[PDB]
């Protein structure tokens, strides 16, 4: 009973880019993605975007979440919400409009605005916002009712209506059965040729339907972005929106014009973000947290007390207490138990630390499984490739791997063991024993006499 | 003759926080830290710290700077300040009332408001300040001498009352033997059942004592703290305060809007501080040093000419001249000489580096001693620590320890010496000498045919 | 025809500093380097920079594209200025007069000064601008003209000439004959005891020579950095210039405010620049880059579609599709080709990277030669120097270097090698084959039963 039709077939030509406008990100995400989260956290089932020539990369990341339709030609608006009319033209219920370009719209504003359309019993709703300086815009009069008595534009407007701080966010809700009806009566008797949704509402006007107008008192979030300039503006918006959200919901952010949270962060209180910290992706950090300086965490989990220092955090795991960095890498599949240590200069790639373990420094730790308790010494790696496969490497609970140790996979390393230095390991080694495999030591006293 | 009670027992519930709200840092030090400073740097002696429930970690960092006093219910500002009466109510002199939750409290203020008071030979003295939206706090009404009339909150204020500028600030100086009498003579006959300091003022005016009011120029020191997003402007007034001091004092600071330095931090002239640097405790940089991009430094000591980039020092001490980064990690005890080198990926801990040393990558120097022009190839590791305790590595001047060496401590390597690429050292290497411990090379060519 | 006067003899005593003013820099070059390039690229042939003692550094770092002139006594900047006619007195043609400590001084502005002067034959020309606060400047009193009256400073101004708002900038352009002529009729009848270059022109007044006056919009760009705060706002003002360009010439910056890109950088369309970047010198960026958050590049060239994470590149090259980082450094005469990738604690200096070659961790190349598609494994060194001397390293194509392998240069491996992990290399190893340099593994099982 509810639908959505996105405009992205934008060439946003002043982006000066390559790329389609709504896939620039802010955040960590195209724009196109923020406002389909708007969109389908209101209510709305089914969801169409408008695509154009070589859209690939359009359809390939928003997937299966969105229906699709091609509009070749740039007619307009309302020529490209009409090419929504093979999924949606005999459908019934409410269907709202918005621009892939707005990012900042959120799912409460698209909630009320359906709302409002609906108790009403309205055929179409303007999504409206109150501006300082409203030159360019279109602006809304309104009749005696409240109701919409027409949108002004600019350059057809008397010297009063160009005072009116009230202007059309160009996002609309339709009965989706009158849309498609009065969008084949609309005509592009314009300098431009094109066809302009706007004219359904004059069109419903003219019939005697209800136009309601509602009013956001965030005109912020109505922000179209039309070039890289308004792109940042779009950052610094998202920035403070969810950087004061976590500030009174508990997390200390010491300098938040210079921290970067994404909007799929959940982030438990008493954490403390330090500066610069970019933290993005769907990313769930605990209670009691510090993440220290200019660390980088995408897509990954972070428990209670642990402490991530100067460090960069992809599609990992980290239990409770656990200590990384500074100057560390977890790369993706890294699972770091509780209380673990991980110091600085090592990296962390699919690979299982239990609880307990440290791996203190300029180690390189890959395919592998290092049990509780165990120690690995400075500059010791998991030799995991061939140049052909990839081959897992196996420690045992509470051992001792000395200090520049090759681990050559497939290889397996028991329990209560000690790994001399500098020993180049081709052999499984049991529990309980000594592995040594180093030269002897020559001194040749004055040698340089 | 000069004393203080710091109020800290407040539940801080817009805090979010399982801590007590003045244990929340402001320039990496709790809130009532920077308030004992400043007032012990305005000349009193003996302070008190009113505390609740569950302050052992007030107490226990605070420690021996204070005495405490216990306040079992909240009862109001009055009723907090009672609870000293154990350490101050037969002291004579000056007591000075401030709250933990203003880190911005300077010492010259208190200072002043203090030489106001005795110079006045008032019995109380109200700190006030002039704010542009005075809504909500008490107004100074000051009568035809310039003195206090009454402090009218806002909620008893006719229309005039309410469009003065100049509030109360809620720190008050006041005659220690005054102070303790009145305070027995509050009552709690209003809506919170909380007994209010400012009624001690009444208190003293309907008995005709003198009442004086010292206004600071600086509205933004006396801020109080109640949630996280005030937290984070705490910190950036304090940002602002400390680099605009050190710019004026000789320092370039590349962009002070990202550089955060902590108020107990000497910086000599013409030290140049890059973006994100981030410089806390007690730490002392010299002249003609360069801090570079996203450095962090805490309570270490930096001579003149060193350069640091992209690294982390805790509790360091860093010579002339001395190059360290980037990404390098001196850790606590690390002492490095004159003309030192220490390069990217390298991590010192406990460890004495004389003068000219190099250890230019890869390397980890721990419980050890480096003499003067000794070079540390690539990849060495100084294994100082056996899985049950620490032991310490010497290695004399003008050596050549060779690449991905490693130095199994306890062991002493002498003057003069080269240690061949590779080798694993286990045992004294005297001076003059070529230590070498390692597989000769076997070649199977056409092995790959 | 076109000649230039900068005055570089400022002793700037608010900079509280041991270097002369001018050499401060902004956006990593000093003050008087971007004015000497705004002034040549205003189409300047002969520039003479006035200094004073002990201005070695000055001469130094400008060298030769500059001629200087000495100014012994401090006795105002017509006396500076007439220092130079060893070199320019019997010249002809436009000279400009600028200071060196404004950086922000455009070439545009400079060109359409000189071009203003001469459409206009005027003897001289003054640079004014428009101001709120006008108060201190000398204000610009027009005739019926529209050129100049006479130049007001505040010290001697009637009330109605103290609501000028256009003020002197102290940047002229002069007939090259009339100033030095007027230059020996300056008299210094003042309580400094100084000569003023303003005096030259009431003397072309006084003469009935043609003065003009030419109004910069931005009056941004004509000031003058006196301390270290206002060295801050001009690399904050040359930031958000620089930035602002790049935007709209299609770069997308995420966060501008912490972005800092000298001006000679140049950066192709849809490149991304994270926050924290620091990229300075001589730089070139090709299209579709991602430099990533908290790097720092200077004079290297980056090409198409490459990504640089966290790392520090200096004097380096880094060919199409090419990854570098996190935690990587690439020191000068780094080169690396088209889909190479350095990994995390990656150091390659004086280095030839050929294309596909990987360099994954923990390594160090110095003064070696990579052939294409090899694969060098964690904690690899080309073992480059000796104490005495540096020697080469050369790697073939499609080789397999093993993990903690140690190449002793200068030494050659051939193409389709195998070296095996935790090998020492003194020799030559030919085409297809395998090379081994470790012992071989001892288990001692239950020796810690
Ligand atoms: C910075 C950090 O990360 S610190 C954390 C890392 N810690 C470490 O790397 C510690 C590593 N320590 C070592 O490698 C030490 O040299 C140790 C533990 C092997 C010393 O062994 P110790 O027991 O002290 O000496 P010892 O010489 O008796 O060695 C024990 C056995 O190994 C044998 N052995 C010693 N060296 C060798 C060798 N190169 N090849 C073969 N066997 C050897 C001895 O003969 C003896 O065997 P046996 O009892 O059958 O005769
Ligand atoms: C990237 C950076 O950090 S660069 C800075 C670090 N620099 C280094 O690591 C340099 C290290 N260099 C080396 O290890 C070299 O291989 C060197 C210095 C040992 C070369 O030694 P050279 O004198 O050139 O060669 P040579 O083979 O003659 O070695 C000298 C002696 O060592 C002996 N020797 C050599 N290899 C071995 C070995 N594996 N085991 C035992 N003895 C050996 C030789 O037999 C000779 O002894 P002798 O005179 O009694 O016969
Ligand atoms: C984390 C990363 O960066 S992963 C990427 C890095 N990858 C690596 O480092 C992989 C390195 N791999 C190795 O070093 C392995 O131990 C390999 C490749 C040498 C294994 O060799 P394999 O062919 O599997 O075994 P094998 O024991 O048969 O060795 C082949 C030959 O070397 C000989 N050999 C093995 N070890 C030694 C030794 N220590 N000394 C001398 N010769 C040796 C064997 O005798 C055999 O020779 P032969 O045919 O004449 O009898």
Redesign the pocket.
């Known amino acids: 009973r509810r639908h959505a039709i996105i405009l992205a077939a934008g060439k946003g030509t002043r982006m000066k880019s390559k790329k389609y406008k709504v896939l620039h990100e802010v955040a960590g995400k195209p724009m196109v993605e923020h406002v389909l989260e708007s969109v389908k956290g209101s209510g709305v089932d089914q969801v169409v975007t408008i695509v154009g020539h070589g859209a690939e990369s359009v359809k390939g990341h928003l997937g299966e979440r969105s229906l699709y339709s091609f509009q070749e030609e740039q007619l307009g608006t309302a020529h490209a919400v009409q090419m929504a009319k093979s999924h949606l033209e005999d459908k019934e219920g409410t269907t709202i409009v918005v621009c892939g370009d707005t990012p900042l719209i959120t799912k409460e504003t698209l909630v009320t605005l359906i709302a409002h359309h609906e108790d009403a019993n309205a055929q179409a709703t303007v999504l409206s916002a109150s501006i300082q300086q409203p030159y360019g815009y279109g602006r809304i009069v309104r009749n005696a009712s409240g109701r919409l008595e027409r949108i002004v534009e600019e350059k057809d407007a008397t010297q009063a209506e160009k005072d009116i701080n009230e202007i059309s966010s160009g996002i609309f809700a339709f009965n989706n059965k009158t849309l498609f009806e009065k969008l084949t009566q609309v005509k592009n008797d314009n300098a431009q040729g094109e066809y302009y949704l706007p004219d359904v509402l004059s069109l419903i006007l003219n019939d005697g339907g209800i136009v309601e107008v509602y009013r956001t008192n965030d005109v912020e979030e109505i922000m179209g972005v039309n070039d890289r300039v308004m792109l940042s503006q779009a950052e610094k918006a998202m920035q403070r929106r969810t950087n004061h959200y976590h500030m009174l919901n508990g997390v200390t952010i010491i300098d938040p014009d210079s921290t970067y949270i994404g909007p799929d962060v959940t982030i438990g209180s008493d954490t403390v973000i330090e500066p610069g910290v970019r933290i993005n992706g769907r990313t769930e950090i605990g209670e009691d947290v510090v993440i220290g300086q200019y660390s980088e965490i995408n897509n990954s989990t972070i428990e209670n007390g642990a402490c991530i220092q100067q460090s960069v955090v992809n599609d990992a795991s980290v239990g409770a207490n656990t200590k990384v960095g500074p100057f560390a890498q977890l790369r993706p599949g890294a699972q770091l138990g509780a209380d673990v240590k991980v110091g600085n200069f090592v990296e962390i790639k699919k690979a299982d630390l239990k609880d307990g373990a440290k791996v ?2 300029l180690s390189y730790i890959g395919d592998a499984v290092i049990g509780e308790r165990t ?1 690995i ?2 500059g010791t790696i998991t030799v995991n490739y061939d140049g052909e496969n990839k081959f897992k490497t196996i420690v045992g609970k509470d051992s ?1 791997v ?2 520049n140790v090759n681990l050559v996979a497939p290889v397996t390393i028991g329990d209560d063991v ?1 790994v ?3 020993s180049t390991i081709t052999d499984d080694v049991p529990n309980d024993s ?1 592995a ?1 495999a ?3 030591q020559t001194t040749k006293e004055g040698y340089r006499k």
Chains 1, 2, 3 share one sequence.
């Open positions: 203190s420094h120690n010494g400075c001792f000395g200090c000690l001399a230095a500098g000594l040594v180093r030269a002897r």
